[PDB]
Structure formats: C-alpha cells, structure tokens
Amino acid sequence: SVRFDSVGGLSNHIAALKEMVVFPLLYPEVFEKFKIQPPRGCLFYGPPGTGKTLVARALANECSQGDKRVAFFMRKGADCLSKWVGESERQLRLLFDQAYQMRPSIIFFDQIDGLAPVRSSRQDQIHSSIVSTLLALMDGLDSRGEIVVIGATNRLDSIDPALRRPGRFDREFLFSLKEARKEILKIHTRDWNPKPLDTFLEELAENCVGYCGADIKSICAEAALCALRRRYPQIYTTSEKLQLDLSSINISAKDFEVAMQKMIPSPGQALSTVVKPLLQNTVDKILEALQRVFPHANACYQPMSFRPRILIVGEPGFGQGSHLAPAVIHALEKFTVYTLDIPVLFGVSTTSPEETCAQVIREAKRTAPSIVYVPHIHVWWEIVGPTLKATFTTLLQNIPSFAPVLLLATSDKPHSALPEEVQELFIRDYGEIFNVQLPDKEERTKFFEDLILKQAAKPERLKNLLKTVVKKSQNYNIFQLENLYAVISQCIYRHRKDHDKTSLIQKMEQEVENFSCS
Amino acid sequence: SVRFDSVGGLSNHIAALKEMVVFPLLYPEVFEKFKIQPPRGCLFYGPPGTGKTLVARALANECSQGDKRVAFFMRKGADCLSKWVGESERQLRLLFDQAYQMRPSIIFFDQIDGLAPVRSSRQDQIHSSIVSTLLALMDGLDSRGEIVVIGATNRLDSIDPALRRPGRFDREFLFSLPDKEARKEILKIHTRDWNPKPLDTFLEELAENCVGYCGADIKSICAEAALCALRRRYPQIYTTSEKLQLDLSSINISAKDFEVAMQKMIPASQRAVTSPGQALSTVVKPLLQNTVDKILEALQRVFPHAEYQPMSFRPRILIVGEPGFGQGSHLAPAVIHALEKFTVYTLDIPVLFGVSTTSPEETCAQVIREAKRTAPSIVYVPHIHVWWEIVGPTLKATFTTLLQNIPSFAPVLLLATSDKPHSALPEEVQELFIRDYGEIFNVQLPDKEERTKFFEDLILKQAAKPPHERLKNLLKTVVKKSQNYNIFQLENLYAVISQCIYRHRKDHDKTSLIQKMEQEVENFSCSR
Ligand SMILES: Nc1ncnc2c1ncn2[C@@H]1O[C@H](COP(=O)(O)OP(=O)(O)OP(=O)(O)O)[C@@H](O)[C@H]1O
Numbered sequence A: 001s002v003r004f005d006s007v008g009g010l011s012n013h014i015a016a017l018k019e020m021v022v023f024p025l026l027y028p029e030v031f032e033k034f035k036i037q038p039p040r041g042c043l044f045y046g047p048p049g050t051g052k053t054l055v056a057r058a059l060a061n062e063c064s065q066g067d068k069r070v071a072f073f074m075r076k077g078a079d080c081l082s083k084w085v086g087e088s089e090r091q092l093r094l095l096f097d098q099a100y101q102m103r104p105s106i107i108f109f110d111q112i113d114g115l116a117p118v119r120s121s122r123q124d125q126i127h128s129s130i131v132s133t134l135l136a137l138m139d140g141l142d143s144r145g146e147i148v149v150i151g152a153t154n155r156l157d158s159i160d161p162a163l164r165r166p167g168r169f170d171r172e173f174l175f176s177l178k179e180a181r182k183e184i185l186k187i188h189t190r191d192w193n194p195k196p197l198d199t200f201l202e203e204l205a206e207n208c209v210g211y212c213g214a215d216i217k218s219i220c221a222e223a224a225l226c227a228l229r230r231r232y233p234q235i236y237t238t239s240e241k242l243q244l245d246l247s248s249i250n251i252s253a254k255d256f257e258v259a260m261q262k263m264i265p266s267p268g269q270a271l272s273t274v275v276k277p278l279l280q281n282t283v284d285k286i287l288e289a290l291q292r293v294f295p296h297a298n299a300c301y302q303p304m305s306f307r308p309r310i311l312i313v314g315e316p317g318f319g320q321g322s323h324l325a326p327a328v329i330h331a332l333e334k335f336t337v338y339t340l341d342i343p344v345l346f347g348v349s350t351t352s353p354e355e356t357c358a359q360v361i362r363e364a365k366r367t368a369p370s371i372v373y374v375p376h377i378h379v380w381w382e383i384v385g386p387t388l389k390a391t392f393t394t395l396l397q398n399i400p401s402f403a404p405v406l407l408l409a410t411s412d413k414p415h416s417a418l419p420e421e422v423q424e425l426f427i428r429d430y431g432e433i434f435n436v437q438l439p440d441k442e443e444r445t446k447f448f449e450d451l452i453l454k455q456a457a458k459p460e461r462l463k464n465l466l467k468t469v470v471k472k473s474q475n476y477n478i479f480q481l482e483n484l485y486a487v488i489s490q491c492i493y494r495h496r497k498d499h500d501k502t503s504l505i506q507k508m509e510q511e512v513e514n515f516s517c518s
Numbered sequence B: 001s002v003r004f005d006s007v008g009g010l011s012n013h014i015a016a017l018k019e020m021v022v023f024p025l026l027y028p029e030v031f032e033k034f035k036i037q038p039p040r041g042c043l044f045y046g047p048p049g050t051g052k053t054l055v056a057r058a059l060a061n062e063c064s065q066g067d068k069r070v071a072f073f074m075r076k077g078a079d080c081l082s083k084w085v086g087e088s089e090r091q092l093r094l095l096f097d098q099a100y101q102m103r104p105s106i107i108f109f110d111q112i113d114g115l116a117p118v119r120s121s122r123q124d125q126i127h128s129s130i131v132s133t134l135l136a137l138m139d140g141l142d143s144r145g146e147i148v149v150i151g152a153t154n155r156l157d158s159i160d161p162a163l164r165r166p167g168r169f170d171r172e173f174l175f176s177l178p179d180k181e182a183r184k185e186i187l188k189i190h191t192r193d194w195n196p197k198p199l200d201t202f203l204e205e206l207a208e209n210c211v212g213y214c215g216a217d218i219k220s221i222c223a224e225a226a227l228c229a230l231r232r233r234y235p236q237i238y239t240t241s242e243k244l245q246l247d248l249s250s251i252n253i254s255a256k257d258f259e260v261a262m263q264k265m266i267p268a269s270q271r272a273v274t275s276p277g278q279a280l281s282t283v284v285k286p287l288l289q290n291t292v293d294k295i296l297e298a299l300q301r302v303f304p305h306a307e308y309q310p311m312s313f314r315p316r317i318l319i320v321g322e323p324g325f326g327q328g329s330h331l332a333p334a335v336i337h338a339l340e341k342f343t344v345y346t347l348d349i350p351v352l353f354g355v356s357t358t359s360p361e362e363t364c365a366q367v368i369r370e371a372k373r374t375a376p377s378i379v380y381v382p383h384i385h386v387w388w389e390i391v392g393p394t395l396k397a398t399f400t401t402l403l404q405n406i407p408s409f410a411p412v413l414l415l416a417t418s419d420k421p422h423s424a425l426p427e428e429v430q431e432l433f434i435r436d437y438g439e440i441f442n443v444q445l446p447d448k449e450e451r452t453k454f455f456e457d458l459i460l461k462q463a464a465k466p467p468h469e470r471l472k473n474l475l476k477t478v479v480k481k482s483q484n485y486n487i488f489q490l491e492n493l494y495a496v497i498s499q500c501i502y503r504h505r506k507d508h509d510k511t512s513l514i515q516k517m518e519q520e521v522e523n524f525s526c527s528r
C-alpha cells in the first residue's frame, strides 16, 4: 500500500539506498564494467521507532510491480525459529535459492538475533548447528549475485560475531529519529474529513518534541478518540446508541491541545509565543550581521572566510544568553552545534576534563562546517584549571585558517573588563563584537495586545491605563517586563467568575500603579 | 461474595474495565465504524498490597454471577511445567484450547515472572522454549476472538519485554498507595459491619495520621485494636490453661486502643526507608499551626499551583528567622508534609557528601534531571547559610548554571531556609531571591494567646488526677515570665514542669508540691 509516498523526510537516505543496493541489482551488468564488487550484506540499524520493515516492504512493492526484473521475499529472523535440529536451516538455502530461481531479489531478515544468536556453551546444540551451518549457508551461497542480504535489528551487538567477517555481512544503514515532520503531517492525514489547518498541523509537529513516527500517528488517533469523548461525554453511563450523529466530532483548535496535554513527551530553542514579537527584530539583526562576517550561512565563486569569530556583549539582564543565543542557534539550523559549558565538562566522571575538550574540537573538525558554543565566557574562564586554558588555546589555534568553523560566545561584563587573554582573542577592529539594546516602543506596545484586550472580554479609560504601563516601561529589562506581564495576567484569572466589571479593572489599575521595581 | 463493593479508593480502573469485559458484549456497534478493536491483555503492576488481586476476584465473581455466562480460568504462578520433555509445553496448549472451546471465558495468570522470565543466554533453555511457545499462540489471538488474558505481577523489570508488545499485552494498570480520601473510604469499608458503628469525624481524624499505609496495613490494625481491647477488658485469661466464662457484651473499642495498636505497628512501605518528611508532634501543633498556615497561604499567593490554568514564573521562597525560631527543624518538615502528592528531592550536606564514590556534581546532575522529569516538583535546600560556605567553587558554578536552564513557567519551587538575615547573607546568593517577588518571610515569636493555649493542658488539667486558684496564679506568672523565649526554651520549660509533675505521681494530696512547682519555675534561667 506504500510506494515511496508514505515516507517523510528521507530525501537523502533513499538516494543512497537505491544507488548502492537496488540499482546494482536493478542493473547488474553495469558494475561488470569497472569491478566495483558491491557488498553482499546490508543492514538497517538505529534507535527504535524508525520504521525499518516498512522500507523493505516498499522495496518489495517497487521491485515486484513491473516486469519482475528484481524480486523480494519478506522473512523474519525471529519467527523463523524451529525447535528442531536443522529444520529452520533449510529455510535460508531454499530461500536463497527460491529468490535465486526467480532472481534478482532482496531478502529481508527481521531480528536475526533469534535465528542466529551468539552460539556459546549455554545455547542449544540445535541453535549451535543452526548458526554454524547458517553462516555457512550465506557466505557460501553468495558472492556472485543477485541476492543482497538486508536485515534489521535494534542492537548491533545482538549478532553472532562470526557473521560479521570479511566477505560476509558488511553494510549498515543508519536510521535516526524535524523536516521530516511536515511531510509526516501531510501524509498521515491524507483522508480526513475534519482536515486540520496547515498551521494547525505545523504547530502539532512543533509541540510533538521527542516523538518518532509511530507516536505521531498515535497522538492523532488519541485526539480523535478524546474528541469523541469531549463532544459526547454521555458515552459513559448510557444505554445503547439511540441518536448520535458522528459528524460533530470535528477537530478544532483546542481539541488537539487538550489531547497533547494528557501524556508525557540541544542549546537551541526558538522564542515562546509570548516572546517572539519582542526579540524577533534583534534575532534577525544578529543573523544579518553573522551573514556579513560568516559567508557560509585557486578558484573563486566559492565562499571563504578567515577564522569566523563573534561575541555577544550586553549589560546583565539583557537576555544575551538567556533568550538570544539559543534562538540564533535554532535559526542557524542544518549546522552541527557543539557546546562547551561546565555541566558538560564536569558532569561526567571516569574521564579527565582535558579528555573531552579534545574530542569535541576533533569531531567538529570532522564535520565542517560546525558550531562550537561557549556560553558565559566571563565566568567560564575563572573556573577551569591552569592546564585547561592552555589546552583550549592550542586546540583553537591548530585550526586551518580557511576552515569555516564558527566560535560563538556570550558575555555579561563589557568587553573592556574581561581578562586580557580573552581580549587578545577577539578583533573588535573587525566585525567580531555585537551589542544588544533595549526593545523599542512598538515592541513594548505590541507586547500587551493579547491581554489588553482580546481575552478579558471573552465570556474606554483602560486605554489610558495601557499607555501609563508603557509610560513607565521605557527602561526596564527583559526580566522585569516578563514578570510584570505575569503579575498582571494573574489578576485576569483572579476574577474569571465575576461578570461585574469596573471592580477587576480597578484592581488591575491599582496594582500597576503599585508595581515598584526601582 | 464480594462484588466491586469492598474495593474502594480507586473508582476509576473499574469503569475502564467493565468497558473491557462487558461493553463489547452489549454494544457491538460503537466499535464497528471507528474500527476500535479493543485490547485483550492487561498488566497489573505496583507496590505490593494495594489491590490488583482484589479487583480480579471481584471481576471473577461478577462474571460468575452477573450476565450469564462468563467462565473463570486461573493458574498459580507456574503450573505448565511437567516432568516429561513434551508435556511441559503441551499442558499449556491443552488448557488454552479447552478455554477456547468454552467461549466466552477469561484467563487469569498471576506471578508472571515465575513463568515468563527475561530471556537471556545465561539461563536454562527449557524456559526459553516455554516462553517462545507461550508467545506463539498468544500472537494469534485475533482469530480466536472474545479471549482476554490478564496478568498480575509485582516487579515490572522481571518481565520479558517481548510479551509487552501490541498484539500480546499492550495495556498496564498501576496500583499505587492510597491517599487521604481513599484511606477514609477504606476505613469506612473495613469497619462496615460493626454493631456500634463509629462516628465519621473519628474516622478521618484517625485517617489523617495514617500516611504510609496500604490495604493490608489498614486491614490489620482493625484487628490489632480489637485484640488490645480484649486484653484490656479481661487480663486474667493469658495465665490460664482451662477455659473461662465471658459475657461477650462488655467488650467495646475506644480510641486509646487504636492509638496503642498503631504504636506497635510499622507501615509496610517504611520497613526499609525513612522519608524526609514529618508532621508536628501533638505537643507542638498548638504552637506552630498558625505559622504553617501563613507560610502555606503566602506560597500559594506566589506559587498558586496548589490551590483554566494558573500561571507561575520560577516560584521561589526563603524562610528567614532568628537561630532559635525553629525554621529549619520544625517549619520546613511541616511544609513538606502538608504538601503531599508532590515528589520532593532534597539537597543538603548529608546528600552531597553523605554518599561515597560519586563526585558531588554527578549527584546534582541526577537530582536536577529527575526533579525536572516529574513537575511540579520541590527542591529542598536547608541551612543555606552553611551549605554555601563549605562547597567548592566548581560545585557552586554547576549548581547556579544548571537551574537557569529550567522552563520559565514550570511549577518548580526552590525551597530554602536561613539563620542569618537576608542582608548579611552572601551577596552572590541574594540574586536568587528578590523581595518584590514576595519570596521573603520573617518568623515572629508567638503571641500571648498561643502561649496560654500551649501551657493550658499541663495546668490545670494534669495536676488534678488522683493515683485550684493557686494553679491559676502559677499559670499567670509562668505565661508572664516567658515573654522573651524561643522555641527551644519554651519546650525545655514544658519538659521540666512535666518532669516535676511526674515526680509526685504517688502523692495523694496536693499543696505539697505547688511550692515545688513554683520554686523551680523561678529557678529557671536561660537568657538566650
Ligand atoms: N518512523 C516510523 N514511521 C512510521 N511508522 C512507524 C515508525 N516507527 C514505528 N512505526 C510504526 O510503529 C510500529 C512499531 O515499529 P517496530 O515494532 O517495527 O519497531 P521496533 O521498535 O524496532 O520493534 P520490533 O523490532 O520489536 O518490531 C511499526 O510497525 C509501524 O507501524
């Protein structure tokens, strides 16, 4: 039922899997020209929840539909278990021949852990002969095509070590657990009478942090199930269905949100729904400046730079590391990010801090371009020992000059107050230091539109009130603004069940005048 | 016998279970359009003695004598094992087929771990064969409709994960320890058929005390008290070989019997651990209940999540009082105990250093991650004036940087107490607590009425029982002369007066010790 249309996000995995597995089986005479000798053993491995067997079934559909030029047999290495001496043994030679009498073919082996476990002194002589003669079945009945052994498992070490030898089972395909999620939401709701809004589904996928595929459909089914709970609360404690129209179970804005809150669900995090219209301008500005310094976000017509470096400096309480920098990291996605802070350096024992400080830089060198994050450099410099500072400096210096790896750091004290070793590390004469500024008047004006007023009247003079709140908030930092918002929004809850107005507005207007934060 | 009546306190897993057993048999239409396909395997788990077998017995009786007809089939741990090589796996299939031929039926398995262990290569192969042949015919349950198999176990871990899969066992029910309202129902249930029915106010007065008990513990004390009353009424029976004569009507159960019965018993869950929470003793309650109330209402004002959705923003608070004001030894345990149902993780010197082989930063890491996992949660840090001047700078930096990562609106409270005032407190800590948040409380000395009530029980009520105005004068002068004392000194004076009262237990006339009482009352001197 799936022909590469119920798969979301896997734009690059498909190209690799088809080119090195199916195409050599789809076009075997081509590789006779150069003698590539493609491997005869392939695997699907990764964390659970990646949907490994469905890909094999899709390959079966692709190969079977047509002229039957390449085939596929579906097999499981966990239901192929026979409690007899050698009866499950014939399954592979017949299968490696049944798929060979009608070759080419791809044979899937789900959970080979049971059919071919680790033969040992505790395992049955049955399974001992099974595994021995079984590896004899595969390494002997291969090496000329056109059978490519594809298997799946949850753990890589759950395989008999004699299987993974030269000239035997070799290849491994990494399946991992957000760009896939838009495609997933598009696909899995292909036939829905209450078709949700595209922004509705995008918010759904945004709020489904940590889910991998199956639970993505599970939440949708659960949302429908609780929709018929909420629209029809009388389903409990009622007689047989007498009059129920099964069309008012339509999913609206609040249905999935009440559905999401009924189960438990990196230094990059976008702003909240309340914070976005306050710092979005500054995030865009810093992104633009970074574009200017860092062009990656002999021969010409190729981007090049000289040691990408940048420092965020702002007065404490300006949210330069509390809200800005993780947001910038989130905005500059599709690049590897690697932090270096105290709980990641001292948070693991059985290792010297020097032992991990080299691994991050080495592996970020491997995957250039990469991002290294060092928050609160003004305090991180005074916690490490004398050797760590020197090791950090030498590791940073050993980078190539034209390597497009960016150093991102944030600070609280002004640049002129830092230790001198930091000072002769940034080039303020260049574009390497960015300043954070207080929000302007429009942002503060638009920060209070929702509560004043789009929900208070939900079942004048307050406008003067409104401007007074702004008339005092010219020079308050982010934390004071947000705490003020929370304290005002509390009173709105305080009189939910008071239809009579002019008494709640009195208490709001007297609390705002009473709010002293000098 | 029992029909869903004696089972009280849950009231929620019964509704979802008749929907499993009865509703599909009566309403085969709601499951038609939506393709509901209700699940067929339930997995009872939880700490022992909280149910999960009483429910099975109630269900068995309900289906035996409810809507005819449903059959009950049950095993005891591991009975499929036989001596021969073929009957070990054949009896299972035989009884399973016998159950299928008797549709409809219900299958009950208890002690799953005794028949379905965790498969591995470090154990015998016969168990591997039996678990495989068990999960074989279980997977083919869709074809053999109207067959439901349920399981009762105690250890979640000791089950092979291969069975805990959609297709075999996709549903689990957790049976945890009961709460106050549920305990009241349990006490009402187990004393139901008592001829002098006790009054309800006594029942929840008692149920306030029971904090760690379960079903079995609650049941047992109702027999312990009866035997204690039996002993109290007729203490001539034990040292006797021959039978005697009893009237059977002089026996009556009083509150003292319950008190002494609870004295010797120990809660089942606390036979290997002591929780970091205590409630005020009876002698102290009329001296700090008001302040516990005021702290509770203030924290409710700042942290309203304990009253569509209340909003909170990094709730914090710090109780500050003089050294002798009992802020770290009485008030904080009271606050932690009055806010039940909240998982609280503590953090003090016997926690960071009280454990070996683990550097303090590691322990802080597990603590903070597990406090974020189950929110709302409480972090306990007592004596912050001392916890801070002993730890290394690295630990301070880790502690400060690891709580800045929290979601702003999460209902996570920081709880701490101090002995020095806020101003003298280290400045680099004072940024965590800001006055406009209302995070600062000052414990004050109790007023005149509180002392008057505190000493009112000793005099003049205890000094009146055989084995008046002068006592009023003595109370007056004592209440006057203790107007500048802290909690420790007050309870010390209480103790010395009580001891002097004890020392004249056998004096048959008063007025011989009133002069004593007054004389050591003057002999008291503390001066802080
Ligand atoms: N990434 C995914 N995309 C789509 N469907 C998925 C995904 N992951 C899981 N599913 C669905 O949930 C089911 C559970 O996956 P599956 O059991 O095959 O994975 P697993 O956790 O490795 O378990 P096991 O190997 O024991 O079967 C799949 O059969 C499929 O229906």
Ligand SMILES: Nc1ncnc2c1ncn2[C@@H]1O[C@H](COP(=O)(O)OP(=O)(O)OP(=O)(O)O)[C@@H](O)[C@H]1O
Pocket (backbone or CB within 6 Å): B006, B007, B008, B009, B010, B047, B048, B049, B050, B051, B052, B053, B054, B055, B152, B153, B154, B186, B214, B215, B216, B219
């Ligand atoms: N909610 C309850 N109401 C009344 N009695 C209860 C309750 N929970 C437990 N009990 C008492 O506990 C007794 C036995 O408990 P039960 O066998 O149900 O526990 P279990 O956790 O399944 O046992 P175990 O783990 O030891 O196998 C019951 O006979 C009953 O007296």
